[PDB]
Ligand binder design. Sequence first.
Ligand code: LMT
Lengths: 150, 1042, 50, 100, 50
Amino acid sequence: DIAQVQVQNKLQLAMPLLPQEVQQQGVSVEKSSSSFLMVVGVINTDGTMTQEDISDYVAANMKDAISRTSGVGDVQLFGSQYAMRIWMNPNELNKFQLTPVDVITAIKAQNAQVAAGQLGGTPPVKGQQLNASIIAQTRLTSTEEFGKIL
Amino acid sequence: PNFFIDRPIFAWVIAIIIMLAGGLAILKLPVAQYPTIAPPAVTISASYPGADAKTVQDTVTQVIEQNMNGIDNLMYMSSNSDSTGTVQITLTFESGTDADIAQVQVQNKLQLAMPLLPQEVQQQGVSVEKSSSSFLMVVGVINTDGTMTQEDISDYVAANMKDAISRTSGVGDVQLFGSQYAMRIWMNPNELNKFQLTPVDVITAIKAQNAQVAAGQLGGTPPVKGQQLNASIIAQTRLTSTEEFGKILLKVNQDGSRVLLRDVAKIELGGENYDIIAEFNGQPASGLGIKLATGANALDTAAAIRAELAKMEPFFPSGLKIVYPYDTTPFVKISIHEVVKTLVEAIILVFLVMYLFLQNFRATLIPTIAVPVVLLGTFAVLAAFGFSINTLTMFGMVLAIGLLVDDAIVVVENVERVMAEEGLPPKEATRKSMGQIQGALVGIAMVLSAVFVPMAFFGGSTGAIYRQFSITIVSAMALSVLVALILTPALCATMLKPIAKGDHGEGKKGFFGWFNRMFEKSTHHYTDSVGGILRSTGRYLVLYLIIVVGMAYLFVRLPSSFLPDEDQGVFMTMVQLPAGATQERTQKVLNEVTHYYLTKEKNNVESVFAVNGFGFAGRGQNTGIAFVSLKDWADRPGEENKVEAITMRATRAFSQIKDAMVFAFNLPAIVELGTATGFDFELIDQAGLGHEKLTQARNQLLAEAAKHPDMLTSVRPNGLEDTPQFKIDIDQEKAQALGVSINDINTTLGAAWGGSYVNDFIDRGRVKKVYVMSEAKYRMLPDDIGDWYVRAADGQMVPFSAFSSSRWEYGSPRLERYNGLPSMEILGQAAPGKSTGEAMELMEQLASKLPTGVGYDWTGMSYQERLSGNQAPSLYAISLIVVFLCLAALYESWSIPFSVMLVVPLGVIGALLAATFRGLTNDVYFQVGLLTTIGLSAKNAILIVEFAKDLMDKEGKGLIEATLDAVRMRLRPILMTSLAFILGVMPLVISTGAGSGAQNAVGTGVMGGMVTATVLAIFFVPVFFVVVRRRFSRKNEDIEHS
Amino acid sequence: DTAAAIRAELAKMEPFFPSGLKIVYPYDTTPFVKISIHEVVKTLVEAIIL
Amino acid sequence: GADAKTVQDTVTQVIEQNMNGIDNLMYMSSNSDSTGTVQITLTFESGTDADIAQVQVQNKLQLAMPLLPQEVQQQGVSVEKSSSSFLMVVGVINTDGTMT
Amino acid sequence: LPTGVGYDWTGMSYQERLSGNQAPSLYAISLIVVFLCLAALYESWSIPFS
Ligand SMILES: CCCCCCCCCCCCO[C@@H]1O[C@H](CO)[C@@H](O[C@H]2O[C@H](CO)[C@@H](O)[C@H](O)[C@H]2O)[C@H](O)[C@H]1O
């Protein structure tokens, strides 16, 4: 544990001089083994769901607890969690005279959470009688809302 | 053992050595109210100004809960996502985990999670802390002459006191209650619109004109050959005045007219945040929370703190007084004082019993020396094992007196008895007697710890609580026995006066003890009578079974606690208003409370500390809480002037005649613990569900626990209910159309209604924050949304009503999580005369009946309790098996032990009787009470049966004769012990004043137990030894032999 | 210990799996150590009988 | 580039404020630079656990964090186990075509 | 020096100050250890004083 601490307190002086891509994709520092103590499997017998559906159930319902189980160093995913996958057409893009870059900025823009504030906020004016939250732009939820992105 | 009887000085040296190590451990030992008891919890706290419950949950919370993997000995994880924009994630760890290593591991996993966070959060600071909730003291700061506002005060605390007190020795942690100064910039939407400017431009203005810039150096390295000058370049300097912030330029107009900040908005030194307002007896007040350093002496920390405060008093601003609303300290002062009172008095009573029974002063000086010595030693044994002088270990010792006391008496009496019996010189009488009780003392040491040790190995917070007692008491006992085989035998053999053969002092003297005949006759009455019973034992076996069935019934029909509640000079009452209320509406209630306590409790209440914005159920304008301090107990006489009755009448007062919920209450002595007959159930969203489904589950379960009043009571949700929240749907198209950048809409919306952290300025030498936010009057009512305009791309202003639609909805003000997943916390307690466990199992039954995607779980108080209770029967199996094996050793029978183990119920029936008539509760102190009582009665029967076995085997005397004799020769000391004891415990059983809950809890059970135990043992032990022995061997027989 | 505890967590989650989602155990270093040492205890008691 | 009197009451004293409840601290001394560096030294009771001490210090300091500057925040503040005496100084020179 | 200007020693002379401060306590304890020891082996209370 102290070794882990000593390594990571140099990792932390290295961090700001790293790419933002690496930095937000996440850096991990761990005391692990070298080989697998064990490999847990999940299958679907009745073929009802595809591989990715599954990889998603595993990553979205289990892997966070199994990685919090005391004494477990690293977990490795055979599969992957879900993502919003946006698969660009180079032609259909060139058609409308647009770049990937525009997609990037767009999605950053129409999809976010916003610090909004409060009616009857603190510090209010005398006798105010209502206190309630302002809910502004909210993160997206369906695939469609992503299709409808302007 | 003999060795010392021929060497009094060597023993004197061992005594001096134990006394000095104890003296040393006494001088430099930690004192705290309680030991570390609760599992270690580390909390990550973060704030996101203006955000809503779902914002902070889905932008910060879940990102942290996912990046918290692989941290060692994780027990459980819970979080709060406050719609007041704060998130708190508490990781409670396995008991005995390194507090410091756990915390470090957490803070460096969060530190890698940091970049995946929002920049507002990343710059507001994420914090990591060790979670006790036991501040040694809570010091208040106020102003009398109304001279300064609460924020003014808060700042004074931060800027003039907090640091010296954190230098005050013995003070480990200081925590601030209030809000530091900030640069508050309050925009006028109208004067903003006039000049065709947005908050956005304000933000950029302030970021740009206020900063420090990398400047450089003259004659820099590498200079040019022959260079002549070296000095620093000082550049653009951060602003300092409110004025200089006024002068910052926002736009130059067409006519050369200037737009200064001064123009569009008010600028003032003001609070960093205005949620929480604190009032100390109606006056403006702010304050500090002091935590006791790890290992520090509590009472000295407090003394130093008050000394530091007085050391600052000549330098205070006008009317700035320090007040002390919360101090655990005088209670520990009085508790410690009272336990010492007990120990010295117990010595006095043992001296007085020993005189009014042996009326020979130099005898009565022996146990007078012994105990003082043994205690001093146990303090050194503790210090050796890293413990402290605290409530648990001190009442551990008050209990131990009896095992120490008896042990000395047993010895000296046996010397006295031999000299007056056979006529030996002092010393040779000693070897007869020590030679007699030696194995008995070694046996008692092994059986007494055979019952006192296994209870130490209890796991959890319960287990730790026991470990304090078990260790204190066992060591006290082992040292008493070593002292009884080295020192007291040495002190007998040397200073004890020789008694003429066949003395017994019957009369001989006129003035001091015509008693001895009186006694003598009677101890014959008694032995005559015991023989009498030894004829017809059967009927006596019957009586015994009656005692046992009655005993078990007493045990079942007695209620368990964890600890007893205490008037602590202090209690508090809590305030909860209807959702959405105003800071000022809550405030009204709290002003009313403050006055109630300052009126209809004029005589009891010293101070009322009302806090608006923080209560128990949550943070918000909506909730307030009032910490109430009481006049010292010296001035509060009756039973009505005590917390029970006080909180009774406060709640009785605030229930009928109120529009909101106001309960008044007292805190448990262990300030973070199991509501005894209570529990903490977690309702868990497990499938890809939504908050609605979970809440429906929760109500559904509330209905089904509403269905079991015979099992369940007052089962309640521990969250905040969904409130009406205001939704602003932005149409992206309309706004892109008119030419307004979506950011501009969002962030001016932001800086308007939420506020924004902009920059930092250096105030009076201390770097502080700069907040840009609305003025009040333009952001209160929904319609005010309208005063706000967005400058479009081209150069035009746009109403929010051009691109925003609005409505009301429901949402949650508090979003809870358990172990990474959405949860809902449910509290509860058991039916009246039912068990906690039954209610918990019925809870699992009700919850198993809940809809799919909804599972269930246990946390906290019912974690520690549900896992650490399958242990008691196992540890008591160890205790009986081990004790029987010990006594089996001491004698030489597999069966003779049963005679002495059969004594246990004789003491128990005494306590269970002693309690039920006192209406007390089978708690820890009563349990430690039972073991202590069992400890003496086993001591006594082990001695009787010892002498019995000894007369039978090494003098060939007959069964009925040897038992009779044994019971005869130890009638006297049994009675001596029990007399002294019953007299020493008597005060604890009839006490009020400080802590008397604990005192009565120890005292009662034991006193009653002692009474029945001796006044039953001196008849039942003989029957045991006899009836047991009459299922043995052959011939011998009833014996007359060589 | 780590493994027995992990089996506990999965067991905790099992009722809430999607329809047809079974767990399978393709690889575990654990049962070999358990049965391997168990043979050695078998032997000590056997040898006492011998 | 900041000046000494700045770094002392913006970074230094802001850091010294959190070194309360640090176990076995003998004395604390510090320096505040116009070359923009600041260094605060905690010397402990003899036999206090070095690694454990580092743990506690960096865990009071990381709470002092919300009160420091972002240039400070981006070039890094480090917490380290410090001697004060060089065990040895290895020298390097070049004999022939003397590189610089 | 004027009011408000105090002093301290650190490092070499802190530690030196501690050697100082400790010598007397060291002599009381070490001397008392021998007195209590000789009083032990040579059972007399008197052999120590001599
Ligand atoms: C300090 C603690 C002591 C306080 C004690 C409080 C008083 C209560 C204790 C008394 C109990 C024993 O009481 C005792 O019972 C037996 C009867 O079985 C009597 O014995 C008598 O009755 C039976 C007949 O059935 C005969 O076999 C026997 O010859 C005869 O002596 C004793 O004479 C009597 O004294």
